[PDB]
Amino acid sequence: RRWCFRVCYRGRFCYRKCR
């Protein structure tokens, strides 16, 4: 299921973000 999208940085460093 889909829910909030977080961008990771090269398999590391992610910026969760729900909206």
From Swiss-Prot:
Modified residues (Arginine amide): 19
Record's keyword annotation contains Secreted: yes
Entry keywords, A to Z: Amidation, Antibiotic, Antimicrobial, Disulfide bond, Secreted
UniProt subcellular location: Secreted
Disulfide bridges in this chain: 4-18, 8-14
GO CC annotation: extracellular region
Keyword Disulfide bond assigned: yes
Signal peptide: none
Predominant cellular place of this UniProt entry's protein: secreted
Tissues/organs with expression: Hemocytes.
Source organism, top-level taxon: Eukaryota
GO biological processes: defense response to bacterium
Family: Belongs to the tachyplesin/polyphemusin family.
Function: Significantly inhibits the growth of Gram-negative and Gram-positive bacteria.
Name used for this protein in its record: Polyphemusin-1
Organism of provenance: Limulus polyphemus
